[PDB]
């Protein structure tokens, strides 16, 4: 039986969004590529290189026109006519716009493609922008996080495959099952917040009792995500706050990579 | 004679272009080019020293953890902070488990398809394949039944007509030398490797808070709250869970990865005589175990002109000989300031002008050590350990050589390690020795907590005036990493990362001397210039990471 | 005539005593005795009908889920509630996954050490052991290397001198017939079984909220909130996770457990000719799939005097013929009221007077069906499915028979299933057929949610006056389970559980007729009356659960 | 090397507390019995039966006098001179008191042994009592729950083995790492409680958004435990409330098996 085709293009990526797949369990990356999808282009795992892999991509864009899911990680740099990311001698923005023309669905995996992320922060040396900014006529599904839990992506793809449409999205085109709620509106340390039980420094008596990390700079009050519920790596109990460190807001534009670790969040 | 381009190079991290002049069927000259830049050094400038690590960790998601740990060490260096020993044990477990994942994925997911022909695996006899491993490995998943199940998955993929990422590969190339049976064994081990690396990252996750991109560090130690009697913190139950994953890694590493490394050498012995990148090698000591950022479990040093007998040991991350030697040039890179720069005085001013064979052709800077080109990474690391007389390293290399000896009747000399296969062997030896690091540091942590030490963090102070310079060294999966922070009036006034793939991938330097990638390719035979598999074999042996090389 | 007592019987659930009269080395008469009572029927009385399931689930933690599900079905019966089909799919997945864990653990952890000699495994040749399975199984973990690792674990345990739960076992008993190699294979499979049953319980956990003792039921449906787009509820990500564990079960079940069942029969064929407990068999249909508590995936029925051709089908949990036939006596049990009682009129009035061969000797009641003794459980279940002409059941039995025929050259007739080994076979066939139930009901759930049905619960109303009666049937891992609830003025006025091990383990009845355990032991050869392994082999084939039998 | 010896006696048990071990991952039950301990007596797994297994127990009680951990699951029935649980012709209370004489440490695993549990509820037909009630001179470590997460038990044993003493206990002799905090003082649904966002019936709109279960009878406010943090089965995200059902208070004497499912908890 034929598997739904996927084209994955990395722009100004660190590869952490691909690496998230190697932690996934449902499906595992081996089951993803052998059973769930046909990964038609992915430069991290491709046997073919250079001329051969660019042939593969051109053939796949033609063969699967109107059928493939396009996935992009990393920001897209517009400064100086796109030369801050060049693949096969051409600006990655041009590779992305060409692949976008025939896509059935387009996913920005990670904060960099979803809203510019760390690559667009500070002075933004390369004029990095989001995938939605380079594809104004297209509905881009945003799966933010640095990187997201890989199942935020895989269950989005599965919804498209199994039920024939995207999952329900919020007003930033983020799937509601993963991004529908503030972390602070579903955080197991909320009782400590409510009682004024706060860690003041790592290793202090409150910190060693699992108290709230608000006064260490926790951005849960201003970050949408599922980090406190789905958490990470499917082992149970693993997310930054449960390990002892505040949320940094890496999901959320204007929070992660903008605010200091210890800068206090606004509470709604 | 002709000029070829390999763009993109796949089965690496990031964006790499390789150009080669081919004369008389052999590479005569090569260019390595990093084709993507972010300016992560500029992004982190003018921030609080304490915030840098969360930003610069995003230099790379393959070598996640490494930039985070180098960044906190750099701030700790500037501030003169001695890290609590519990924080060292936790940092060390994370780096060792991460590196285990990183090397396994490199050998199987990134490199194996240079050496392995999956089409040829369809012609294999699974029973014959299993019989070949009798007395060679004790691994419990080399049965004919395992191999038949794997062969059927390949059959089903080919039958679907959707080969995807396995499509248009180098199947039947004349440089593919494995018998069908060995191709099938390799594919089975490729799939088994994915289970092992998943377990390595469960160790990382339970201390880091997630992976990729850990979130448990701090300038001053770690965010893990140690309390054996505490609900919701790092208690004995959580530590037992960590140990349950540490224990799952050894068998695959010793019985599959170590053995496959010896077997690839046995079938490709010509690759012990090509891909030499340099005559100088650098590594830093790693896994500090005392209360003052020292007493490393792994040694470091500098080898000049391949002379192990006269190498210089490096025992400290504060070694002024190491610190003062390091410079970077942008003469053949797309930056404005071209003279060699010490990283505390480094600039990163973009000056893209397009590709020129004799001008600027890369976003990678050109690092030197006292004016010389140096290879870093597992080959450097292994050669320094052999120079130090480290028995653990001698013994592990000897185990790979004994498997090679048994299969070929030939031995391996140190001279043969200066090669594409030597590089791969150093990586495998490193992965094997890291499993003892994990057992040692888990035990050290349990013992130290039992003595009543739950300390994990010392809150720093940052003077609001003055200028302070710090450097954080780390022996990353790809080699010696350093982050260089200048603090002025309480904020980061300069930040420079010198990354292992910068050393190896960097273009021609201020003296037009050739870096390791470009040097390693001279003399490479290329049977088919349209399908230069031989070039990609040598380049993959360095485990390129271009997000790392360029940042 | 010699009298022996086996007290405690181990490798069961709960507290069992078996007594046997032995004439010339052959059991002539036996007594089964449940030696622990809690009064769980009295504990649940006088409560809200909605609360019963959380309390009576604690009848048993081996057959966890089963009393919870029977209790909500009993309340739903009383109240005339039709359960939402999504709640049925979820209940069915939990029961099927739980039963998979239960059967695997019974065959390996509880039963195998009756048939397997671990000391003999130390003399095995691991290579010869592996060669014996060529063309018999496609399981991927039957290599000599797997078997050598397992042999070394046994060696290390024996070398420690601390055998613990393996100590003073029946090593070298004359009834131990397996060769060394087959003993070693069985120990390898014992340890592999523990991984498979853990995956089965991960299915149960993700729908139940934990296991043991699920927490997702309600009178009126389930507590799982179906919302594919919802954070923190049963969404598509959670369903994909459940599916990932369902997919992990089949290979062990089909390639190890099914094969080992055929092989034990091949080495112990005399055990096809003893251990007949009854001539009448009962099972209820299971896995309802419609909106009205019916359309069962597995059929039920009543077989009288072993005649499959004249059996009576049962297609409804509201079948008046089934309901009206069931009674229990305490003539030879430690309760006061001795005449057979229909469970809606049942009492459980303790009347302990100690052991008497001819009087009261057990806390288990004596159930009858229209005055007959009846065996329940997997043998009953299999025979009813064969009587129904269920092709899935005939085909799965035929696969076990084909392996047996390959090893022995002999076939198996239905007459040979009325036996200790037939009982074990019916259990294995059940476990194998349950894997298709899990695939079917997962697919049904995904499909139904896709049609826009997210309903899971119908809130009940309970009239505050009036008296009304309900019964909840369930085909549990040990056989037909029924919970019988009378509601008067809104609270439970009577509660009676009639549990599968009650049918099988109960003592002599109102007519002094012998129950299955006691009847099955007549004719058992006992080589050594100090070590009556042959008695425990037959008793373990019924998978005794005495917390269940007695409650 | 010698492994620390364990004697496990079941009284009025349902076997769920033993079965918990079959879900454990750190250690797995196979690693527990081959590597961590020497399980000298356990009737569920013992090769030996009858006279042979009673010989094993007598031999182990002598050889390991002063060294073994005694574990009991189930309540102990005192009514009618102990006859509601008879093993090898003797009341289980007599077997337990004899084994208690030479124990290095004594653990009540589960609510039944910790405080009587379900078997002691309602009219208490058998006069079921706790292990501490039958061993007045002994410090019994209580690991309640029905059954507890098996690691609440295994990490308690591991603390005894590795550090030579029990973990820190509260005033009910429960280990603080597992029972030191109310579930409601560490529950990820606390934000919903605080906002008055309550499920009113299973399957209603609030329930299908993961809202607080207080008005369904959640006993989190009156139950000490680690169900919201450690959770169950090590798969991530699995505890009763996360699955959609209120806490019943099964850890806590006077809550579980006493209060109705839908009866409201007192909030502190
Ligand atoms: S979102 Fe984060 S992990 Fe993904 S490419 Fe960007 S920096 Fe890397
Ligand atoms: S501030 Fe952070 S740790 Fe505290 S309750 Fe909110 S999200 Fe949780
Ligand atoms: S505590 Fe619960 S699981 Fe354990 S014996 Fe008692 S009823 Fe069973
Ligand atoms: S009442 Fe229950 S669900 Fe609500 S916040 Fe408290 S413990 Fe959590
Ligand atoms: N390892 C790694 Fe990444 C590179 N090159 C760093 O540091
Ligand atoms: N299966 C099971 Fe338990 C018994 N007997 C019940 O019902
Ligand atoms: S930093 Fe990111 S991963 Fe989650 S906990 Fe905060 S959104
Ligand atoms: S019923 Fe028990 S298992 Fe935990 S969630 Fe409540 S204490
Ligand atoms: Cl501590
Ligand atoms: Mg740099
Ligand atoms: Mg009853
Ligand atoms: Ni990197
Ligand atoms: Ni039971």
Coordinates of N, CA, C and O in Angstrom, one line a residue, chain A residues 9-15 41 43 72-96 119 125-129, chain B residues 7-8 13-17 33-39 334 350 352 363 546-547 550-551:
Chain A
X9 N 12.4 20.2 4.4 CA 13.5 21.1 4.0 C 13.9 21.9 5.3 O 13.1 22.5 6.0
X10 N 15.2 21.8 5.6 CA 15.9 22.6 6.7 C 16.4 23.9 6.1 O 17.1 23.9 5.1
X11 N 16.1 25.0 6.8 CA 16.5 26.4 6.4 C 17.6 26.8 7.4 O 18.8 26.3 7.2
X12 N 17.4 27.7 8.3 CA 18.4 28.0 9.3 C 18.2 27.2 10.6 O 17.8 27.7 11.6
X13 N 18.3 25.9 10.4 CA 17.9 24.9 11.5 C 19.2 24.5 12.3 O 20.3 24.5 11.7
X14 N 19.0 24.1 13.5 CA 20.1 23.5 14.3 C 20.0 21.9 14.2 O 20.9 21.3 14.8
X15 N 18.9 21.4 13.6 CA 18.7 19.9 13.4 C 18.0 19.3 14.7 O 17.5 18.2 14.6
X41 N 12.1 13.3 0.9 CA 13.3 14.2 0.9 C 13.6 14.5 2.4 O 12.7 15.1 3.0
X43 N 17.5 15.5 4.2 CA 18.9 15.5 3.9 C 19.7 14.9 5.1 O 20.8 14.4 4.9
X72 N 9.1 22.3 7.2 CA 10.3 23.2 7.3 C 10.7 23.4 8.8 O 9.8 23.8 9.6
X73 N 12.0 23.1 9.1 CA 12.6 23.6 10.4 C 13.6 24.7 10.1 O 14.2 24.7 9.0
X74 N 13.8 25.5 11.1 CA 14.7 26.7 10.9 C 14.0 27.9 10.4 O 12.9 27.8 9.8
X75 N 14.6 29.0 10.6 CA 14.1 30.3 10.1 C 14.5 30.5 8.6 O 15.4 29.7 8.2
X76 N 13.9 31.4 7.9 CA 14.2 31.6 6.5 C 14.8 33.0 6.4 O 14.2 34.0 6.8
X77 N 16.1 33.1 6.0 CA 16.8 34.5 6.0 C 16.6 35.2 4.7 O 16.9 34.7 3.7
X78 N 16.0 36.4 4.8 CA 15.7 37.2 3.7 C 16.8 38.3 3.4 O 16.7 38.8 2.3
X79 N 17.6 38.6 4.3 CA 18.6 39.7 4.2 C 19.5 39.4 3.0 O 19.9 38.2 2.8
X80 N 19.9 40.4 2.2 CA 21.0 40.3 1.1 C 20.5 39.2 0.2 O 21.3 38.4 -0.3
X81 N 19.2 39.2 -0.2 CA 18.7 38.4 -1.3 C 18.8 36.9 -1.0 O 18.9 36.1 -1.9
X82 N 18.7 36.5 0.3 CA 18.6 35.1 0.7 C 20.0 34.3 0.8 O 19.9 33.1 1.0
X83 N 21.1 35.0 0.7 CA 22.4 34.3 0.6 C 22.9 33.7 1.9 O 23.9 33.0 1.9
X84 N 22.2 33.9 3.0 CA 22.6 33.4 4.4 C 22.2 31.9 4.5 O 22.5 31.3 5.5
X85 N 21.5 31.3 3.6 CA 21.3 29.9 3.5 C 21.2 29.5 2.0 O 20.1 29.8 1.4
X86 N 22.2 28.9 1.5 CA 22.3 28.5 0.0 C 22.5 27.0 -0.1 O 23.5 26.4 0.4
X87 N 21.6 26.4 -0.8 CA 21.6 24.9 -1.1 C 21.6 24.7 -2.6 O 20.8 25.3 -3.3
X88 N 22.6 23.9 -3.1 CA 22.8 23.7 -4.5 C 22.9 25.0 -5.3 O 22.3 25.2 -6.4
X89 N 23.5 26.0 -4.7 CA 23.7 27.3 -5.3 C 22.5 28.3 -5.3 O 22.5 29.3 -6.0
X90 N 21.4 28.0 -4.6 CA 20.2 28.8 -4.6 C 19.7 29.1 -3.2 O 19.9 28.2 -2.3
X91 N 19.2 30.3 -3.0 CA 18.6 30.7 -1.7 C 17.6 29.7 -1.2 O 16.7 29.3 -2.0
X92 N 17.6 29.2 0.1 CA 16.6 28.3 0.6 C 15.2 28.8 0.5 O 14.3 28.0 0.3
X93 N 15.0 30.2 0.5 CA 13.7 30.7 0.4 C 13.1 30.3 -1.0 O 11.9 30.0 -1.0
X94 N 13.9 30.1 -2.0 CA 13.4 29.8 -3.4 C 13.1 28.3 -3.4 O 12.0 27.9 -3.9
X95 N 13.9 27.4 -2.7 CA 13.6 26.0 -2.6 C 12.2 25.8 -1.8 O 11.4 24.9 -2.2
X96 N 12.0 26.6 -0.8 CA 10.8 26.5 0.1 C 9.6 27.0 -0.7 O 8.5 26.3 -0.8
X119 N 17.0 32.2 16.0 CA 17.7 32.7 14.8 C 17.3 34.1 14.5 O 18.2 34.8 13.8
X125 N 20.7 39.2 12.8 CA 21.8 39.4 11.8 C 21.4 39.1 10.3 O 22.0 39.7 9.5
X126 N 20.6 38.1 10.1 CA 20.3 37.6 8.7 C 18.9 37.9 8.2 O 18.5 37.4 7.2
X127 N 18.1 38.7 9.0 CA 16.7 39.0 8.5 C 15.9 37.7 8.5 O 15.2 37.5 7.5
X128 N 16.1 36.8 9.4 CA 15.4 35.6 9.6 C 13.9 35.9 9.8 O 13.6 36.7 10.7
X129 N 13.0 35.1 9.2 CA 11.6 35.2 9.4 C 11.0 33.8 9.4 O 11.6 32.8 9.1
Chain B
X7 N 26.6 19.1 -3.4 CA 25.8 20.1 -2.8 C 24.4 19.8 -3.0 O 23.8 20.1 -4.1
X8 N 23.6 19.4 -2.0 CA 24.1 19.2 -0.6 C 24.8 17.9 -0.3 O 24.5 16.9 -0.8
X13 N 25.0 16.9 9.8 CA 24.2 18.0 10.3 C 24.5 19.2 9.4 O 25.7 19.6 9.3
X14 N 23.4 19.9 8.9 CA 23.5 21.2 8.3 C 23.9 21.2 6.8 O 23.8 20.2 6.1
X15 N 24.4 22.4 6.4 CA 24.5 22.8 5.0 C 26.0 22.8 4.7 O 26.7 23.8 5.0
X16 N 26.4 21.8 3.9 CA 27.8 21.7 3.4 C 27.8 21.5 1.9 O 27.0 20.7 1.4
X17 N 28.7 22.2 1.3 CA 29.1 22.0 -0.1 C 30.6 21.6 -0.2 O 31.4 22.2 0.5
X33 N 32.8 24.1 2.1 CA 32.1 25.3 2.3 C 30.8 25.1 3.2 O 29.9 24.3 2.8
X34 N 30.8 25.9 4.2 CA 29.6 26.0 5.0 C 28.7 27.0 4.4 O 29.2 28.2 4.3
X35 N 27.5 26.7 4.0 CA 26.6 27.6 3.2 C 25.5 28.2 3.9 O 24.7 29.0 3.3
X36 N 25.4 28.1 5.3 CA 24.4 28.8 6.1 C 25.0 29.4 7.3 O 25.8 28.7 8.0
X37 N 24.6 30.6 7.6 CA 25.0 31.4 8.8 C 23.8 31.9 9.5 O 22.9 32.3 8.9
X38 N 23.9 31.9 10.9 CA 22.8 32.6 11.7 C 23.3 33.8 12.5 O 22.5 34.7 12.8
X39 N 24.6 33.9 12.8 CA 25.1 34.9 13.7 C 24.7 34.7 15.2 O 24.3 35.7 15.8
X334 N 33.6 34.3 4.6 CA 32.8 35.5 4.3 C 32.6 36.4 5.5 O 31.5 36.8 5.9
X350 N 29.8 39.9 8.8 CA 29.6 39.2 7.6 C 30.0 40.0 6.4 O 29.9 41.3 6.4
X352 N 29.7 38.6 2.7 CA 29.4 37.7 1.6 C 29.7 38.3 0.3 O 29.2 39.4 0.0
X363 N 31.3 30.1 5.1 CA 30.9 30.8 6.4 C 31.8 30.2 7.5 O 31.6 30.8 8.6
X546 N 27.6 21.4 10.5 CA 27.8 22.7 9.9 C 27.1 23.8 10.7 O 27.5 25.0 10.7
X547 N 26.0 23.5 11.4 CA 25.4 24.5 12.4 C 26.5 24.8 13.4 O 26.7 26.0 13.8
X550 N 29.7 26.8 11.8 CA 29.4 28.2 11.4 C 28.7 29.0 12.5 O 29.1 30.2 12.7
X551 N 27.7 28.5 13.1 CA 26.9 29.2 14.1 C 26.5 30.6 13.7 O 25.9 30.7 12.5

